[PDB]
Design a protein around this nucleic acid. Structure first.
Ligand SMILES: Nc1nc2c(ncn2[C@H]2C[C@H](O)[C@@H](COP(=O)(O)OP(=O)(O)OP(=O)(O)O)O2)c(=O)[nH]1
Ligand SMILES: [Ca+2]
Ligand SMILES: [Ca+2]
Ligand SMILES: [Ca+2]
Length: 341
DNA sequence: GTTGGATGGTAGT
DNA sequence: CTAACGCTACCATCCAAC
């Protein structure tokens, strides 16, 4: 079983560099402007030149401009990037039909019926890098291993414009030596909990009672870590089915005034329903980000599908419910559809 | 004692 | 207005309904 994972380099910024080669070789920062005030919002990504200065995905645009004033700041055009992504995804498709698209910029290929071993895998990975570079002028990072998790870990180790194989012996070693925090799915919270039990490496999970481990971090997370640690994790490549779709927007200013909020909510509904496109949801949730950035939410599941008209009516009821049961001012408002038929 | 919908926490973006 | 997008996925906990 061999899995080939491709993850495009500084994707949004790189697309813009391809669309405008004069940008190449300079700091570039792609931004999600919230509309709230001048330069309100956060950064989607930035190129490696910008990262040298601390500018990276997630930080506030005002933090970016503070530490890197003279960079080029462009707004995010997701649709433009999505078009390039789909074209690349189809190139990937001509090397393997067995493909898992995980984000706008990455995908997992099962290549066990195309290559004999890790060498031929690596050569395929160089072939794939070349093709994407010729056809779209995008550089990507390939990670090859016996499974999805390790293909992703391998890519992470080789980022910008690399390629890396983690073969079976290195898996054994990484199960022993890789800091547990560096395992996909273990964030800050879960890392702390694993330190309190003195569990620092994947191998440390095989020397602890299942029941004691599941109590601390949860059943699913325990079964995941133990499975990895046993060298048994083997989730296969499967087409991803979108489970939920929605839209959230930042308001020009905080409010508890229904008539002031409604317009934003109704925009979120229209654009959500456009993104649904054929799908019929049975569950709707209204999501509100309060003045102190806490996320609160009210929803409802129907026994049948939700029509646009019901989405308008219920979302208003749900938003009324949030205002009734929570006293803080609202700052962002959104909606989310799930349980598709 | 067991389902699953409502709500929220954690993760990776 | 004065920092903190916009998104998706998965799972834990609560607690009325079984
Ligand atoms: N809005 C938003 N978009 C993000 C965020 N993180 C990543 N993205 C978008 C922009 C990225 O170009 C694209 C792919 O993200 P990646 O996580 O793979 O990082 P990126 O390609 O930008 O740099 P790379 O060398 O992987 O690290 O997804 C984020 O926090 N917010
Ligand atoms: Ca990625
Ligand atoms: Ca990337
Ligand atoms: Ca971590």
């Amino acid at each position: 079983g061999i899995v080939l994972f491709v993850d495009f380099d500084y994707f949004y910024a790189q697309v813009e560099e391809v669309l405008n080669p004069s940008l190449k070789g300079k700091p570039v920062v792609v931004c999600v402007f919230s509309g709230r005030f001048e330069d309100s919002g956060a950064v989607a990504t930035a190129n490696y030149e910008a990262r040298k200065f601390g500018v990276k995905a997630g930080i506030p645009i005002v933090e970016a401009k503070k530490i890197l004033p003279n960079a080029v700041y462009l707004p995010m055009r997701k649709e433009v990037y999505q078009q390039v992504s789909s074209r690349i995804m189809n190139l990937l498709r001509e090397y393997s039909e067995k493909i898992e698209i995980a984000s706008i910029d990455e995908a997992y290929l099962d290549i066990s019926d195309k290559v004999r071993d890790y060498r031929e895998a690596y050569n395929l990975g160089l072939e794939i890098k070349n093709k994407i570079l010729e056809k779209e002028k995008i550089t990507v990072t390939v990670g090859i291993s016996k499974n999805k998790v390790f293909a992703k870990i391998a890519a992470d180790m080789a980022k910008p414009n690399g390629i890396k194989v983690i073969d079976d012996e290195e898996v054994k070693r990484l199960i022993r030596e890789l800091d547990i925090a560096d395992v996909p799915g273990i964030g800050n919270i879960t890392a702390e909990k694993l330190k309190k039990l003195g569990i620092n490496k994947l191998v440390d999970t095989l020397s602890i009672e299942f029941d004691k481990l599941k109590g601390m971090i949860g059943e699913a997370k325990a079964k995941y870590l133990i499975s990895l640690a046993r060298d048994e994790y083997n989730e296969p490549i499967r087409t991803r089915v979108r489970k939920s779709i929605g839209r959230i927007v930042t308001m020009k200013r905080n409010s508890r005034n229904l008539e002031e909020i409604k317009p934003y909510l109704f925009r979120a509904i229209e654009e959500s329903y456009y993104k649904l496109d054929k799908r019929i949801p049975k569950a709707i949730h209204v999501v509100a980000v309060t003045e102190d950035l806490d996320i609160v939410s009210r929803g409802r599941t129907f026994p049948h599908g939700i029509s646009k008209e019901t989405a308008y009516s219920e979302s208003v009821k749900l938003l009324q419910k949030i205002l009734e049961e929570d006293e803080r001012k609202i700052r962002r408002i959104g909606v989310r559809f799930s349980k598709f038929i």
